[PDB]
Design an enzyme around this catalytic site. Sequence first.
Site, PDB file in Angstrom:
ATOM      1  N   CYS A 134       0.669  -1.332  -0.295  1.00  0.00           N
ATOM      2  CA  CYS A 134      -0.218  -0.182   0.236  1.00  0.00           C
ATOM      3  C   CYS A 134       0.971   0.730   0.244  1.00  0.00           C
ATOM      4  O   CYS A 134       1.550   1.588  -1.376  1.00  0.00           O
ATOM      5  CB  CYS A 134      -1.159   0.212   1.558  1.00  0.00           C
ATOM      6  SG  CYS A 134      -2.465   0.731   1.059  1.00  0.00           S
ATOM      7  N   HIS A 171      -0.256   1.718  -3.747  1.00  0.00           N
ATOM      8  CA  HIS A 171      -1.535   2.178  -3.587  1.00  0.00           C
ATOM      9  C   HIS A 171      -1.867   3.468  -4.377  1.00  0.00           C
ATOM     10  O   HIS A 171      -0.921   4.144  -4.685  1.00  0.00           O
ATOM     11  CB  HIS A 171      -2.115   3.050  -2.229  1.00  0.00           C
ATOM     12  CG  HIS A 171      -3.807   2.484  -2.298  1.00  0.00           C
ATOM     13  ND1 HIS A 171      -4.252   4.039  -2.782  1.00  0.00           N
ATOM     14  CD2 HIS A 171      -4.006   2.123  -1.101  1.00  0.00           C
ATOM     15  CE1 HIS A 171      -5.270   3.534  -2.622  1.00  0.00           C
ATOM     16  NE2 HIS A 171      -6.029   2.462  -1.566  1.00  0.00           N
TER      17      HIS A 171
END
Lengths: 188, 188
Positions: free
Chosen positions: B105, B125
């Site tokens: 992420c 992400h």
Amino acid sequence: ASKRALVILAKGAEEMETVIPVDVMRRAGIKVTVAGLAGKDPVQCSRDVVICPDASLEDAKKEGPYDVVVLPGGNLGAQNLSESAAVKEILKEQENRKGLIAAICAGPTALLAHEIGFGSKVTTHPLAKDKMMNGGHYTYSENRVEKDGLILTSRGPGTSFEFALAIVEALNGKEVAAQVKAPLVLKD
Amino acid sequence: ASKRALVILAKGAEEMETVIPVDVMRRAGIKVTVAGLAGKDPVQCSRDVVICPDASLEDAKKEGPYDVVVLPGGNLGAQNLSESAAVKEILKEQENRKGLIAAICAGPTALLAHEIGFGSKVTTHPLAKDKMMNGGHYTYSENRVEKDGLILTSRGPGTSFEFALAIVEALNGKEVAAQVKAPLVLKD
């Protein structure tokens, strides 16, 4: 005007099935209380992750009512939930006031222990099916998430995201669930 | 003959991205140490889940080497990882001995902060892409899991299971990963 969730956390609970719904529900603006069955002390989960609850179940019981009561899974966690009189009282009260009850993996076997929601369609982890179906008091489903009346069940750690978003949809509606889902980078 | 994983846990870490790999890796028989960046005290994660680490990073540093170092995401967690000299030292040493480095992420932005793995293909992400690509030191991928050499990256909370199983496969092989995956009731 804020919805409230109670997550009951017992030793041996599956930590993924605990953290994912808590996280996702708070992303949805739900006020979540992670309540320790045995008190406020840290809880050792099934794979040795140690989580600090927000409150004891005794204290959280007094700050109800809750729009959803959430029972994580984990074999030993679910057994502890099944044996607790405090859990029985909370669930019966939630059933009487027609509040939502959500349980995942082995969690639903606590519903049978406490005679909750008999006659509902439910799912469990495949390994918990025989235990849940003892007596034929429920109808079994193999859907990844199952919702019958006020009983919402799900199958395993890998269904935890779908389980949590079903709770959000039930409480806050389909649009909030969709908004919360997008930043998660879920596949489907 | 037991593989070892180090998970570095900082305030503001995404608790789902922490617990899922820890849980799944322990299901695979990997010895996982959840190390608190700031010490042994409990860590408040991004959505207020409080996790007790197994050790301080200072102590876990001395019990290396680790077969994988895992950096969870969470915007504020990743910033704390990016600013820590102790993390820099651990990552550089892991890169030198050609051990696996895994980040999810926003976690990969700590690799840029510490000049780790330049020239690798990485994912993040979507909201962390611009930060990761500052300077063009990596090549960006939109795959849910990306592995280039010894750098393994992934995109978000919803890719956490795929991320964790990729670590298991890298460490313990494809058959163990498949055995661990089946009881999870993952969709694909």
